[PDB]
């Protein structure tokens, strides 16, 4: 009854151009079985949204990667928020939500915007830049580690550790094996920065350790919660900003609309998150026999959600392949959906908005003038290099 497919969604072939295979996964049926990895898959918006919003059936405490924590050991101690289910997830989630609160965004917005404006001004003096290393990577690295309270030394481990975590969600392929082989130095840095004395006062990390006396988390849980903010978000935001610059370069009429109304910057980044979906996939594990899209999925089965495919499902989106900065983007699953919906989404949207705002006010044209290179990762989609020429307004 359930179509069986041989598509490997974690192959370099798939990463190079996933969109034809994603339609095949969508059009095969609401639920498919991936014989390569022995998991169920949902690629349409409806089923992806349904699975995300049923955490009691499709749990996260057995791992949101391929590995079932009931069968194998996790490569690192489980996340207290990402790899936890309610009610154990609830109170650590509330702490991270208040650490990255709307009030916190108000405290840091003016500084995040000034750094975004300064970066664009600097890049316009060079003209020909790499929109990834010099822009998409350079700007979040200039605001987020400081907002975190991290020391200056050792920040070169942040992006490698981010890519290691994302690769470790994947199947035991070469990308995952090689990432774990290289992991020890990045792992040693991150865990040490999670200790209270190593986090600057007023920053995100210090605020987590200060939240350890309310009955929501204990002092021994704060290091792992700081680890969550060092394991997630940085590369996704970089890939989201890099995809926005790439889209504005290939859809030049959308850059012209953004220039004419810079207040579209926030939705221009939100559309880039849907268009690119920096987090392509996440797993769930069934705690029960469940019926999903006419399929009967047994207990203890892994279910692979195609977030990027759900954001390009023509059953849900009109012209899903087009970058449209005025599209009604509400409802996209680029940040997930439900109780686990990205707790750091306000940080990412703040960084993305103020960067696109600086581009909208200061840049007249963005022209690709070099070979574009894609970075391969078991979980993340993003560009490695994006040579562009910036023309000042
Ligand atoms: C474009 C930027 C981002 C994207 C596309 C993204 C993607 C996602 C997605 C899809 C989830 C859902 C996980 C699940 O359902 O299992 C998630 C959760 C999470 N994200 Fe993000 N994220 C972004 C930015 C950030 C930032 C800036 C931070 C931290 C400062 C962050 C930290 C987290 C954490 C801690 C979780 C776990 C929340 C939970 O399990 O309740 N992310 N992210
Ligand atoms: C990439 O998405 C995430 C989200 C949370 C965590 C974590 O809590 O460690 C890691 C990766
Ligand atoms: Cl780790």
Automatic annotation (TrEMBL):
Keyword Heme: yes
Keywords assigned by UniProt, alphabetized: Heme, Iron, Metal-binding, Monooxygenase, Oxidoreductase
PROSITE patterns: CYTOCHROME_P450
Cofactor: heme
GO MF assignments: heme binding; iron ion binding; monooxygenase activity; oxidoreductase activity, acting on paired donors, with incorporation or reduction of molecular oxygen
Residue numbers binding heme b: 89, 93, 284, 340, 342
Protein family membership: Belongs to the cytochrome P450 family.
Protein name: Cytochrome P450
Lineage, opening ranks: Bacteria, Pseudomonadati, Pseudomonadota, Alphaproteobacteria, Hyphomicrobiales
């Amino acid at each position: 009854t359930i179509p069986h497919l041989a598509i490997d969604p974690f192959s370099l072939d798939f990463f190079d151009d996933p969109y034809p295979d994603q339609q095949t996964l969508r059009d095969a049926g609401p639920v498919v079985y991936l014989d390569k990895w022995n998991v169920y898959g949902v690629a349409r918006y409806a089923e992806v949204h349904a699975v995300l919003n049923d955490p009691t059936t499709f749990c996260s405490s057995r791992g949101v990667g391929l590995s079932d924590f009931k069968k194998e050991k996790p490569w690192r101690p489980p996340s207290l928020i990402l790899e936890a289910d309610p009610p154990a997830h609830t109170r650590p989630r509330a702490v991270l939500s208040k650490v990255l609160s709307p009030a916190t965004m108000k405290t840091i917005r003016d500084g995040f915007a000034a750094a975004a404006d300064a970066k664009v001004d600097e890049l316009l003096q060079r003209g020909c830049i790499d929109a990834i290393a010099d822009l998409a990577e350079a700007y979040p690295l200039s605001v987020f580690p400081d907002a975190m309270g991290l020391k200056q030394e050792g920040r070169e481990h942040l992006l490698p550790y981010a890519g290691l975590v994302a690769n470790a969600f994947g199947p035991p392929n070469e990308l995952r094996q090689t990432a774990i082989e290289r992991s020890a130095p990045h792992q040693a840095y991150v865990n040490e920065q999670c200790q209270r004395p190593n986090l600057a006062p007023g920053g995100f990390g210090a605020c987590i350790h200060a939240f350890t006396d309310t009955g929501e988390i204990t002092p021994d849980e704060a290091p792992l919660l700081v680890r969550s903010l060092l394991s997630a978000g940085l590369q996704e935001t970089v890939n989201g900003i890099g995809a926005a610059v790439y889209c504005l370069a290939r859809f030049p009429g959308e850059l012209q609309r953004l220039r004419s109304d810079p207040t579209l910057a926030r939705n221009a980044f939100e559309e880039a998150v849907r268009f690119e979906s920096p987090v392509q996939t996440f797993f769930r594990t069934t705690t029960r026999e469940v019926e999903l899209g006419g399929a009967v999925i047994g207990e203890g089965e892994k279910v692979l959600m195609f977030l990027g495919s759900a954001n390009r499902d023509p059953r849900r989106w009109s012209d899903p392949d087009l970058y449209d900065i005025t599209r009604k983007t509400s409802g996209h699953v680029g940040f997930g959906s439900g109780v686990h919906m990205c707790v750091g989404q306000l940080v990412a949207r703040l960084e993305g908005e103020v960067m696109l705002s600086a581009l909208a006010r200061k840049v007249a044209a963005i022209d690709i003038d070099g070979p574009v290179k894609r970075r391969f990762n078991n979980t993340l989609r993003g560009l490695e290099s994006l040579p562009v020429k910036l023309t000042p307004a």
